Ligand SMILES: CC(=O)N[C@@H]1[C@@H](O)[C@H](O)[C@@H](CO)O[C@@H]1O
């Protein structure tokens with residue numbers, strides 16, 4: 778599923794991301810826009826053989842099991858396929874564990890390089906929330 782901006786903001790808010798560990802909703806929407814272009818079906822293979830899955834491009838090296846990342850962890854205790862659902866619950870519940878891990882949203886390279894220190898509120902401007 779390809780989310781609209783305001784549609785994803787409302788879904789993230791419903792699932793408890795707005796100000797989760799101090800990160801305003803705009804941060805999460807901005808991160809999804811630059812990680813996946815709001816596409817729940819987004820996959821990208823890393824140089825190390827790990828793969829990033831879903832709207833927040835969560836990595837099989839640490840967070841989910843795809844059966845093809847030797848020596849990796851499954852810290853969210855989910856198959857990576859669950860992160861590709863039209864329903865964002867699995868991606869949101871895993872995002873909560875990641876952002877609590879000590880490095881906050883710096884775990885999302887696109888957030889660090891394209892969202893961090895920007896006017897992230899623009900991503901939820903005009904939305905019914
Ligand atoms: C929290 C999370 O899994 N972030 C991943 C990161 O590990 C990976 O390196 C990158 C791919 O380049 O996409 C995402 O930002």
Ligand SMILES: [Cl-]
Nearest residue numbers: 781782783810
């Ligand atoms: Cl947009």
Ligand SMILES: [Cl-]
Nearest residue numbers: 801802803898
């Ligand atoms: Cl915001």
Ligand SMILES: [Cl-]
Nearest residue numbers: 844845846847
């Ligand atoms: Cl594996």
Ligand SMILES: [Cl-]
Nearest residue numbers: 788863864865
């Ligand atoms: Cl949803």
Ligand SMILES: [Cl-]
Nearest residue numbers: 799880881882
């Ligand atoms: Cl933080």
Ligand code: NA
Nearest residue numbers: 837841849850
């Ligand atoms: Na894994």
